[PDB]
Each structure stands twice: as structure tokens, then as C-alpha cells.
Structure 1
Amino acid sequence: MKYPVEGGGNQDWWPNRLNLKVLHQNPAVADPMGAAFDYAAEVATIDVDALTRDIEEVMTTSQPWWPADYGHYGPLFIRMAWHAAGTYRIHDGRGGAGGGMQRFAPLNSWPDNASLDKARRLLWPVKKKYGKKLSWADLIVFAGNCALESMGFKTFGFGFGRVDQWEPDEVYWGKEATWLGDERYSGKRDLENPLAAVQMGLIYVNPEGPNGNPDPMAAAVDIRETFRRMAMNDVETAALIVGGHTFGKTHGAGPADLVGPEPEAAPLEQMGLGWKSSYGTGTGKDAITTGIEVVWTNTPTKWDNSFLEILYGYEWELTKSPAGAWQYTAKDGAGAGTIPDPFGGPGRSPTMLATDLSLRVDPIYERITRRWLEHPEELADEFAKAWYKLIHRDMGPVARYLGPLVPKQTLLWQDPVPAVSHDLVGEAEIASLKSQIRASGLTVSQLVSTAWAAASSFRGSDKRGGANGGRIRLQPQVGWEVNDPDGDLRKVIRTLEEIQESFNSAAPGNIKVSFADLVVLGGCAAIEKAAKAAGHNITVPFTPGRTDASQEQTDVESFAVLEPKADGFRNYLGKGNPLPAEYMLLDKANLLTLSAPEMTVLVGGLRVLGANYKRLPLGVFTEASESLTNDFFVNLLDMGITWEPSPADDGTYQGKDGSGKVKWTGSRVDLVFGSNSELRALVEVYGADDAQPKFVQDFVAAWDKVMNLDRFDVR
């Protein structure tokens, strides 16, 4: 239908096709910074106090195009930072403040991010001054932290180092083609995975209650669950909501139909700004943001215990803002004129949202907030800890936290590992340990499967998971179905520990090795052994420095989201995946941050290496096992094989030769590489006659890339 410059593509002719562009997000060519750029280096040199001072100058310097409530943009900036982090979800670890995504589509034009577009525009003079040394990602969330401290709250600390990106993160936010649409519930109130919001374009919940019904008791069930799915428990949730509504006010001064198009749909001349309003001045006094007109506290620019003193201090009755939105006001005209107007007007009466009353009406939130009514210091403590978690949740290993405000305290949710407490294995020790692992009885399959089990639990979205920690032998990973607990895993683990014990006893100097490194090295040792069986002498690069975590450093509930329901690299398909196998493979490869070439060598390599879940013959197109050849590619391209969906319809295929006899069996994941015109192209590369040396080179680079995915401790 359309020009490519305007969006036309192959997806238009075949709507449901495999979209391989998820394997080339943020390509170097789109990046203006050049290959040598390293943000971490830059921001480590930034003057934090100059930055803070300049932010605090922006916060108190009102701008005519969006005048500042109470002469302070602070509350506006805490909501910005809360919304930027607030998109995070646990199921896949996507969203979050990590990549500065609120500045792009569709997040920059979510209905719930209305007036954040001006909010980030106000911070331009800060970015202007600090340039390369300060990512918008870092600035957006830091501005909120500064807002907090500016207005009287001592934050627990802050980590710099979020890398700014240049095109939007393609995230599934839901199936609704309508803003604020809700097609995400089944059963009683079961919310569709991976989502962590109640409707499309909202951060968590409806400010007017479930589906717009201002029932605080019901709303609490939505707050409990969305926040759960953003890694927040009851105490953190409560802490955050009260902590947050302690500052600022909502905006709904006129009718919402008087508000223009969201930033993405808006006129060129609006310069990236959206929701331009025709009500009065359309800003400041006359500002419509949500359509709700609430000022929770008498001190909207100061941290105190006023929020709870009000919530519990008055009785609440349902009412309508000047835009027709549900909210609560204090009964019997009580508190008449106690709350101040943003722009000097007369005082107002106490107001709360339906969701604020959830904190008072829900049994659990009741016990928590009535406690902080009487003991306000516990609230600061819990908000401090929660806010730090909020804006850092998706920054992964603490190695990534940069700057003078990063505190020393280790947090369980950071999935911490011990510091390196001995000398690391040098070249001679690695070569020693490789030989030992090869002499241990463990097979190529066992070592490669265990190594892959451990490293491929990493996801690039929130940077959780991976081989570091040696968590493969801890719960839950030790009992994951894909890691095949009742399988060989425990034989492999016990063997690697004995070698760990052996080496660490006989070891020279003060060199000691971790189990975590040995798992990975066993993989590297096995890939060398296989390469030689195939007539190649290569060594597989290993990078030491993994440490072993204890069960107590490993939150079992938090690691549950990291369990694969599918792994196409092991020909594993569990139940409950949203899409057919091959779409789950691209997603798994996207999570491991792999290119299409890198995904392709790994599948083919791993199949002939025997990495398949339960050692199934699906996609093992080779006569020689324990041998790193390109056989998978050669055979998938063989036209002597006729492929047919299996008689016992089980998601598998039969490859029959000329005689009629089955030679090969395949999964959908296996066949997709002969079927997808773009994957076949990659298969014709590594399936050529000159191709086997290149296949081994590229497999090893890929495998190494995966083993090192969580290694921010050495980058």
C-alpha cells in the first residue's frame, strides 16, 4: 500500500511473518557517537555537584510555555522519573528507565505520559551543558532524585551509566489498537503476560479505579498485581505511592476534548510537544494532564507526613473534577481552604484519588500505612529503599552503577555476587583445568549443555541472569525443566565442584577458582575437544572472574521470571508461549542480544554438539556426534530430503530421503532455517564447501559472546 519512507514493507503482504529486525535493534549506523564511544568513561568524569546545582536551577526557574506549579518543577520531575522507570515488567524485564525510552515512541505519547514531553524539554539546558557526559536516560531519573532531595528527602543514593539509544525499543505493550483499551484479562482477573499495566498506555493502574469505577477496595487488587509485576511488594508499593503523592498535584482544569494530539501525532511546529490545550492558557493554571484535579498535600513541595495525616485525617466522598473525572474530597466541607493553589489562588479542600484511598481501605495497605501514620521515619526508610529499587531495577549487575553517589550496601534484588577474594586463574591454570575437565568423564553434550544452561539465563532487557554467580546449582535454576533437573545436571555439578576442590587445594600461590568459572570453562573445554574431532585446532576464549553466590544471595521468587518457557537453542518448547516456536527463538535470541548470523551458528553448532533438551534427535543433522562440524547447514540444504509434518502431530517433522525412509527429524525451530528466505540465506553461508573453518570461528565468537553476557565486572 505505502512507500517504505512512510512505512510500507513485507509485513504488509504477509502480516504474521517472522520479523528478523528484532535482531538488529539500535544498529551502529543509527548511532552518531562513533565506534570508540564509551559512555561509562564519560559519565565517570561528570561533576555531580555542578549537575545537581544546574538541575536545581531548572527546577526553580519557571518557563512561560509551561509555568511551574508552586514555582517548583520538582514534583513534575519525580513523576517523570517514576513514569520512566515505571514501564518495567518482570516477565521479560523490558521497559524501565534503562534506555531513556520515554523520549521515543510509543512511550513519549502514552496517555499516562501526558505533559512529560514538556517535562523533559525543561531539562534540555542541563543536557546542553553536560553533553556526551550525560545520557537522557541518566538525566530523566536523576532529575527525579534531585527533585526528591531538593524538597527535603534524603535518597539512599544513585547510579550513573544508562546508555542512551537512538531508535525505540520494540516492546509488546499489549494487543489493543485503541488507547486505554483493555483486552488483557482472562479468568477472574488474570492479567495477560508479559504485561504489568491494566490498559494500553498506562503505567500501572487506572487513577479512577478499575475500568473507571472508583472502588478503592477493587483498585487495590490492581495496584497489588501491577506493582508485583514491577518487582514491588506490599510495603514497597505503599511506600512509593505515599512517597510520591507527598509532592505535587494532578491536572484537570478543563474538559479533555479541549486537549490536542499526542506528541507523535502533532503538528511539526509544536517541535515534539503534544497535547496542546485550548482551555484558557492551556498551561499552568489551566493545565489538563489527566483530567483529575487533586492536590494531595498542604505542602506539595516539601517532604513531611502530611499525606497520611490527610488520608486518615478526613472522611472521603466521591466527586468530580472540572473534567468529569472521579476523585475524592473531604466530607462535610472539612479542610475548606487548607491546600494551596499552584499559582497563588485561594486554598482548596483535601482531595485524594480512588487509588490513594486503596491505601486506607485495603486490609494489608491499611496495616502498613497506619503504622507510618504513627511512625513517619519508617516511611522515609521504606520509600528510600523502594525509590532506589524503582529507578535501578533494570540496571543489572552493580558493576554498572557509576559515580560518587553509589552506596556500598549490597541489595538482594541486585542478585549480588561475592567480590573476587583470591588471584585469578592465569593462562597455565586455564589450560590445566581444561585438560582436567576433559579427563573427568563428562561428555561434550553434558559440558556444553550445562555451560549454555547457565549463561543463556541472561536477558539483555534488565541485564539479570547469566553464568556469573554459579546459580545453576542453586534454586530455582537447578530444578528448571529446561535445565532438566532429573537429568545429568547434578552429575555435572558434583564433578565440577570436585575439580574446584581439587584445583583449590593443589593450587599455586594464592590462585583459587570458582565453580561459576568452571561451568563455563567446561563448555569451552568441550567445544575445543569437539573442534579437534572435526579436525580444527582452535582454543575457545575464556574470561575468568565469576564468583559463586550463596542460596541466601539468590532470591528464588525473583529468579522465577528468568525461567525459559522456550529455548530454541536447546530445542525446548514448554507450554504457554504466546507465539509458535520460531517466534520464541527470535525472542530468546533477542534477549541474548544476538544477531541473525550469531543466532544461526549457535543453533547449528549446538545441535551437533548435543545440547538439545533430553538429547532428542530433532535437528541433529549429523552422523558424527561429539564433533563440531557444519553438518546441520549442509543437511538442511540437501534437496534429497523431503520434509513432511509428522504423522503423530507433535510439532515435529520427518525428513525422508529418496528410498522413502526417514533420515532426519526436525522441530519448527529447525526447519525455519531452511524455510525463512532470510535465514536460508545465512544457512547457505555456513553450508557452503568453503564454510566449515568460518563456521567454527563464528560459532566460537558467538558462544564466547554468550558466556560473557553478564560480565560487566570486566567491561
Structure 2
Amino acid sequence: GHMKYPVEGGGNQDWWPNRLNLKVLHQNPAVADPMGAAFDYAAEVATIDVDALTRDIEEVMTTSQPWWPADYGHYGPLFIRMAWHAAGTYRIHDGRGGAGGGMQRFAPLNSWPDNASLDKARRLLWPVKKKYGKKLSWADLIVFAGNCALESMGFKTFGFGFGRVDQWEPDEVYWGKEATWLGDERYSGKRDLENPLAAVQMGLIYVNPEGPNGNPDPMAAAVDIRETFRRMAMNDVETAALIVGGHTFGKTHGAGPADLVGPEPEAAPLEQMGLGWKSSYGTGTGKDAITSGIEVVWTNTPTKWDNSFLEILYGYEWELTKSPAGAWQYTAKDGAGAGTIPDPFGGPGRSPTMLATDLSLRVDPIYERITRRWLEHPEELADEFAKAWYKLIHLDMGPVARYLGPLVPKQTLLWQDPVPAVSHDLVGEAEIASLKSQIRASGLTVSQLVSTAWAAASSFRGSDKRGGANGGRIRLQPQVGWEVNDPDGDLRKVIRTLEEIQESFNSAAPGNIKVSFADLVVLGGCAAIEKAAKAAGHNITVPFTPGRTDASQEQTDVESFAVLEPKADGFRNYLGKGNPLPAEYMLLDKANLLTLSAPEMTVLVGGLRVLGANYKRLPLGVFTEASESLTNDFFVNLLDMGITWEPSPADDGTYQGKDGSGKVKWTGSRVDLVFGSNSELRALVEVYGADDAQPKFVQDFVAAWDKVMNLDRFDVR
């Protein structure tokens, strides 16, 4: 290699390529954010004139620009594409991707080959952003532009939520191992796609427009479509709807040779003002645009919603052919339909053309059955597409509470994981006290109590904001029978006891107050923690925010929740099979998902260990002599040089810690030892392990607990 300046990207990952990267816990730091801590986007966007906004976007769409002139004089379709690529990175495995951070404007995504030209697309909207300033995020604007495009070309959309917060440095996501753009080192078996990924190649949104690995076989392309879309939460109906609806607008761009297209934005030179893919071919823009290399124009009404796409697809026979840049497309057999497809810049007509993936929709059995139906019933398409699209651009916004502004529809949807609205008066300070008492009297140990509250709350992920302790989904499928949550243990026992306390309280009922199961689960941990803190000479009181409600099993899509099952929870010292990296990297990814900082992550492991939140209540990492008592013993003992650590002879990624007389005194996993071993983590352990550290540990621990308990609580935030 060759070490570089830090200003030029060099650092410690250059010496030890595989070390833990603690930087994933301080993504998008306050200092980096020019808005200042005062700033509350929700507050700003809810003052926004939506009509004025729509009018301003419409004006942009219909005002062509020298530096990237507009197909058919209307940018709408490009804006639709844009919005789709914005939302289309989302994947269900980890909730990462999606249009929620406006990440498309930063690396790597701003320079993905599949996002060619979208740089131009984004730039075009600056005039709108200029006008709205802080009241409108890029995150919100990019997908809204796509939604206004649909409107302005006569398709009525189902609604729209504002509220995506802009970020100031790019979100670090794992996009695959491939070191080259468009590479494919991500399949095995018949055609099994590497988790978590939901594209077929590096730098693609979903599938190859020319079919798997460039091979234009529609039956084969469908398998990839089906699979990648499933992993972006779209089933068969939604998928079909999405592509047909999509390609009812605009056209592709492959006017001349692929190799006359310069380098992508991050590699572009300075005078290009952050715009890449400059074309030496022709004018290089407009008439001559090379984006994807393909040259299809799907409908004869590229800037209007109607049924041509499905009509064209079924109303001809198709034969293989090559774009002016040598790309596989389809075109109509025996020169049928010649001249009926209009030119983007008033040239002559053109023949009916289609992507290999478009034919999938007629050639695959399931896609056909669906799309033939909509050929004779377009108002069914217009309905399904309205729905899919809405879901597509809202998938990663989590709880419906977050959706903002005039256009949010009245109706809730299953994939929003909804929860009943608060229907009664909420418990006050007195009933809270009262209940806490009752919960300790219930004979549920601190261990069960905390184990449970954690199990509930920690199901959350910051990525798409799904999961959490709201909804009380811990008692429904599939959460109630997750390995890590342990059904074999006593979770059912704990649930039952808690429901009983709920009912009791709910008869007693002072006035019109009721308590939900969801609140009670969380309250339980809070009570337990209060107890465990006393049992080690502290009178701390753990804060609690009531308001959670209880979902029915009907409001809970079992299949959808599959993806939140922890395969690894270092906080509960759980590690089941098939994680990509060893235990400790899993811990970090998990902390990153819970929106925790390294300090927060540290104290939680500390506290959780000694409260015996541990899975199967194993002794690993429980470096205390005391039972169910909240102390920093974890930290003090971790730092004890009188203990000597070796891997267990019974080889199984666990370890023994012996003292001066050779007795095994402590055992522990990798997740436990990495805190005393990694120099950054050990630095933190030394803070909480000092002699003066006790009250501060208890404080910081509670502050963190309470943070995790509140992660999904957008309803009050």
C-alpha cells in the first residue's frame, strides 16, 4: 500500500484493516450540522405552504434548462425516476437504505452507475430549495418532486407525508463486497442472494435492465425482479404495479457509445460543480443523452398517465435488438407500429420498444396473470400503483406519528405497523407510583422484569424506525416466540402476571384512567431497575412516559416482523447462527441500530450484565458477587489485572478468568472481553470503573435505559 494524510483519507484502518470501527456510533455528529441544536424540522415544515410548493415544482418541471434540456419539455418523468431511486435502495434485512435521509445526494449513492443523470435531476430542483430554505429538506423535496410529477401528469396519488430530516454526512451502509462497479460476488446455490443485500450487482437499485448478468432472458429476469423486490418489501402485485406505473412515463437514454461518458460525480473534476458523467458524444445532453445506454421509449404518451404501456406490451410481438450504445432491448416484430412512438426533441417517430425486464411482466406466469387483468381493467392498476408508490416512498418513516403536513391521508395501513390511538386518560404520577409498587409485590424477579422490558424496547431499529416497545407486540407472534426472547424461559409467565396487574388496576380505576399492557411491560423494567439501584445504596427514580397502546395480532404482520428478529444481541449476550462477522462487530451494528453512542453502549452492557438480563441467564460477563443489584462491578472486575484470561478449553468462543490461585473465577464471551481489550472501549470502561464512578454510572445507565425505552415514541416526541 501507501499511507496517506488523514485529510486525504488515511488513518488506523490502514494498519489493521479489520479492527472494530467505533465511528459507526458517532455518525452525523452535532458539530457537523450547520443548523444548530435549536433547530426542529418538524416545526419548520409544518409552516410550509404546500400549494405554493407544488406550484413552484410544476414551474421547474416545465422550464427546460440549457445544461440538461428536458425530454418532451417536461422533467416530470426524470423526477419520478429520481424519487424511485431515492426510495429504491431500501432493504428489509436491516431497514437501511430508503429515501429517509436524502442519502442519494452523497457518496456512494450520488455516484452509483444506476443513479446516472440524477445529479442533474437534483440540481434542477435547487431553485425550489433556494426558495424554501430550512422549511424543506432535500430528503423531503426529492420524493415530493416525484409525487408532484405523478400529479401533474394526471395520476392521482394516494397521499404524502413530510418530515424526513436532512443529514450532513453520508450514512455508512454495507452495499456488498464488490470492489468494482456493476460487479457480482453476491450469489451462490441456485440463485441465493447474500443477506442483507437487495440488488443483483454493485451499484444497481434492483435488477439489471438487460437481464441477469447482461443476458436478456425475460423468464430469468423475473426471478431477479421477484427476489429483489421482495427484499424491498414489495410482493407480486405491488411489484408489477410499480414497474408498469413507472414506465408509463418518460424514456431511457443511450444515444451514442457508452465509453464517451466521463467519470461519475465523486471522481469528476472541480469545474463540473459536483456533476459527473459528462458526455463528449454530440452535445452530450438532451437529444444526445447517454444515461443507461439503453434507448427505449415505452409509451406513446411519455408525459401522461393512461394505459399505453400495458397496451403496447400486449399489443405486439417482440424481438431482440441493440441500442445505439450496444445494449439489449426489445422492439416490435416485423416493423409493426413504426413511427407511432414520438421523439423527445421533435425528431421523427420511433417504433415500440421495451426492456428485457418489461417483457418479464408478460412472460412470467404470475406477472402475466396480474398484468393481463389490468389490460382490461386499468382502474385496478391506477389503484394498486397509487398504493405501492405511497408505500414505496414512505416505507422507512416508521410510525405514522412522524408523517407531517396537509397531505397525510386519513387511512392507516398494515405495513405501517399501526397501534390503537390513546383512547383513555393516561396514568399520572400517583398511579405510576402505585403500579411500580404492585409490580415489585408480584414476585417477578428483577431479572425477568428487565429481560422483558429490554426484549420489547430493543426490537427497534433507527434505520427504518420499525420495532420498539410501543404496540406491546412482545406478546404477539412472532416476537413472543423468538429464540432470543426465550419462550422456553418464562416470558409467558411474565406476560400473564403483567396482564393480571393490568386488569386489577383497570377495575380499581380512579376516574377514566386505563393502563395498556405495552406501558406496563416498560414500567416493569423501570420498577425493577429502581429496586436494583436501592439494593446497592442508591435512591434513583427511573423516568417513565406513558402513552404506549396495544396492537392486536391483526395489526401485526407476522411475516413482516421476521426481519427484526435479533440473530445477535450483545446486550443480552445472545449470538445465534449466521451473522456475517464475529460477536463483537455484531454488538456495534446492534448499538448503531439502537441509535446509541459508545458511552451509552458501554453502560448498558455494564448494567444489563449485573441485572442478569443475560439470555438463558448465563453467567458470562456477570462480574459481580451480588444478585440483581445495580453497580459498576462489571467495569471494576473487567479492569482487574489479578484475573488472567484464556479461551475455554471446551472451545466455543468463550473464555475463563482465573486468579492468583488458578481457580476459574469469571467466565465471559467475546462481547464481554472486547470492552477490556479494545483501547477505545477500555478507555470508557476506566471511567465507569473508577472509585468515584458509582453514582455517575447509575445516572448514565438510567439515561440510556430511558433512551432505549423511548426510541419508538414519536407520538410524544
| Offset from partner CA, 1:32-89 (integer Å, 9 cap, x none) | 0000100000000100000000000000000000000000000000000000000000
Report the CA distance between 1:563 and its aligned residue.
0.3
Cα RMSD for the two superposed structures: 0.3
Report the CA distance between 1:635 and its aligned residue.
0.2
Report the CA distance between 1:186 and its aligned residue.
1.1
Cα distance in structure 1, aligned partners of 2:188 and 2:47: 50
Report the CA distance between 1:491 and its aligned residue.
0.3
Give the corresponding residue for 1:124: 126
Cα distance in structure 2, aligned partners of 1:485 and 1:92: 24
Cα distance in structure 2, aligned partners of 1:222 and 1:30: 40
| Offset from partner CA, 1:584-618 (integer Å, 9 cap, x none) | 00000000000000000000000000100000000
Give the corresponding residue for 1:465: 467
1:181 aligns with 2:190: no
Report the CA distance between 1:507 and its aligned residue.
1.1
| Offset from partner CA, 1:393-447 (integer Å, 9 cap, x none) | 0000000000000001010000000000000000001001100001001010001
Cα distance in structure 2, aligned partners of 1:319 and 1:433: 73
Cα distance in structure 2, aligned partners of 1:496 and 1:34: 43
* SS of alignment partner, residue 497 of structure 1: helix
Q: Which runs of 5+ in 1 are unaligned?
A: none
* SS of alignment partner, residue 691 of structure 2: coil
Give the corresponding residue for 1:99: 101
Report the CA distance between 1:688 and its aligned residue.
0.2
Cα distance in structure 2, aligned partners of 1:527 and 1:589: 21
Report the CA distance between 1:453 and its aligned residue.
0.1
Give the corresponding residue for 2:579: 577
Cα distance in structure 1, aligned partners of 2:676 and 2:474: 33
Cα distance in structure 1, aligned partners of 2:215 and 2:403: 42
Matches within 5 A, 1:471-620: 471-620=473-622
Report the CA distance between 1:670 and its aligned residue.
0.1
* SS of alignment partner, residue 266 of structure 2: helix
Q: TM-score, normalised by structure 1?
A: 1.00
Cα distance in structure 2, aligned partners of 1:297 and 1:236: 20
| Offset from partner CA, 1:303-362 (integer Å, 9 cap, x none) | 001100000000000000000000000000000000000000000000000000000000
Give the corresponding residue for 1:285: 287
2:663 to 656, 661, 671: 661
1:627 aligns with 2:636: no
| Offset from partner CA, 1:564-583 (integer Å, 9 cap, x none) | 00000000001000000000
Report the CA distance between 1:176 and its aligned residue.
0.2
Cα distance in structure 1, aligned partners of 2:356 and 2:465: 35
Report the CA distance between 1:181 and its aligned residue.
0.2
Cα distance in structure 2, aligned partners of 1:62 and 1:361: 38
Cα distance in structure 2, aligned partners of 1:202 and 1:224: 15
| Offset from partner CA, 1:256-312 (integer Å, 9 cap, x none) | 100000000000000010000000000011000000000000000000011000000
Cα distance in structure 2, aligned partners of 1:275 and 1:432: 66
Report the CA distance between 1:449 and its aligned residue.
0.3
Report the CA distance between 1:250 and its aligned residue.
0.2
Report the CA distance between 1:140 and its aligned residue.
0.2
Cα distance in structure 1, aligned partners of 2:33 and 2:102: 15
Matches within 5 A, 1:343-354: 343-354=345-356
Cα distance in structure 2, aligned partners of 1:358 and 1:541: 55
* SS of alignment partner, residue 664 of structure 1: strand
2:639 to 634, 637, 640: 637
| Offset from partner CA, 1:223-279 (integer Å, 9 cap, x none) | 000000000000000000000000000000011100000000000000010000000
Cα distance in structure 1, aligned partners of 2:244 and 2:162: 26
Cα distance in structure 1, aligned partners of 2:223 and 2:466: 28
| Offset from partner CA, 1:683-705 (integer Å, 9 cap, x none) | 00000000010000000000000
Aligned residues: 715
Cα distance in structure 1, aligned partners of 2:292 and 2:594: 38
Cα distance in structure 2, aligned partners of 1:226 and 1:694: 48
* SS of alignment partner, residue 618 of structure 1: coil
* SS of alignment partner, residue 277 of structure 2: coil
Cα distance in structure 2, aligned partners of 1:298 and 1:356: 16
Cα distance in structure 2, aligned partners of 1:213 and 1:499: 63
* SS of alignment partner, residue 692 of structure 2: coil
Cα distance in structure 1, aligned partners of 2:505 and 2:191: 54
Cα distance in structure 1, aligned partners of 2:361 and 2:133: 42
* SS of alignment partner, residue 429 of structure 1: helix
Cα distance in structure 2, aligned partners of 1:544 and 1:61: 51
| Offset from partner CA, 1:499-552 (integer Å, 9 cap, x none) | 010111101110000000000000000000000001000100000000000000
1:340 to 324, 342, 345: 342
Cα distance in structure 2, aligned partners of 1:666 and 1:253: 62
* SS of alignment partner, residue 685 of structure 1: helix
| Offset from partner CA, 1:464-511 (integer Å, 9 cap, x none) | 000000000000000000000111100000000000101111011100
Cα distance in structure 1, aligned partners of 2:503 and 2:710: 24
Cα distance in structure 2, aligned partners of 1:677 and 1:54: 53
1:455 to 449, 454, 457: 457
Give identity over the alignment, percent: 100
Report the CA distance between 1:625 and its aligned residue.
1.4
Cα distance in structure 1, aligned partners of 2:667 and 2:509: 47
Cα distance in structure 1, aligned partners of 2:227 and 2:383: 23
Give the corresponding residue for 2:242: 240
Cα distance in structure 1, aligned partners of 2:283 and 2:79: 22
* SS of alignment partner, residue 117 of structure 1: helix
Cα distance in structure 1, aligned partners of 2:49 and 2:225: 38
Cα distance in structure 1, aligned partners of 2:327 and 2:163: 40
| Offset from partner CA, 1:357-385 (integer Å, 9 cap, x none) | 00000000000000000000000100000
Report the CA distance between 1:9 and its aligned residue.
0.5
1:134 aligns with 2:136: yes
Cα distance in structure 2, aligned partners of 1:375 and 1:313: 15
Report the CA distance between 1:194 and its aligned residue.
0.3
1:414 aligns with 2:429: no
* SS of alignment partner, residue 330 of structure 2: strand
* SS of alignment partner, residue 246 of structure 2: helix
Report the CA distance between 1:136 and its aligned residue.
0.2
Cα distance in structure 1, aligned partners of 2:547 and 2:286: 54
Cα distance in structure 2, aligned partners of 1:289 and 1:491: 60
* SS of alignment partner, residue 551 of structure 1: coil
Cα distance in structure 1, aligned partners of 2:509 and 2:439: 16
Give the corresponding residue for 1:87: 89
| Offset from partner CA, 1:177-206 (integer Å, 9 cap, x none) | 000000000111000000000000000000
Q: Which runs of 5+ in 2 are unaligned?
A: none
Cα distance in structure 1, aligned partners of 2:651 and 2:95: 34
Cα distance in structure 2, aligned partners of 1:248 and 1:60: 14
Cα distance in structure 1, aligned partners of 2:673 and 2:25: 19
Following TM superposition, where does structure 1 have runs of at least 4 consecutive aligned residues deviating by more than 4 angstroms?
Answer: none
* SS of alignment partner, residue 668 of structure 2: strand
Give the corresponding residue for 1:10: 12
Report the CA distance between 1:90 and its aligned residue.
0.2
Give the corresponding residue for 1:26: 28
Q: TM-score, normalised by structure 2?
A: 1.00
Give the corresponding residue for 2:710: 708
Give the corresponding residue for 1:164: 166
Cα distance in structure 2, aligned partners of 1:505 and 1:205: 57
* SS of alignment partner, residue 264 of structure 1: coil
* SS of alignment partner, residue 715 of structure 2: helix
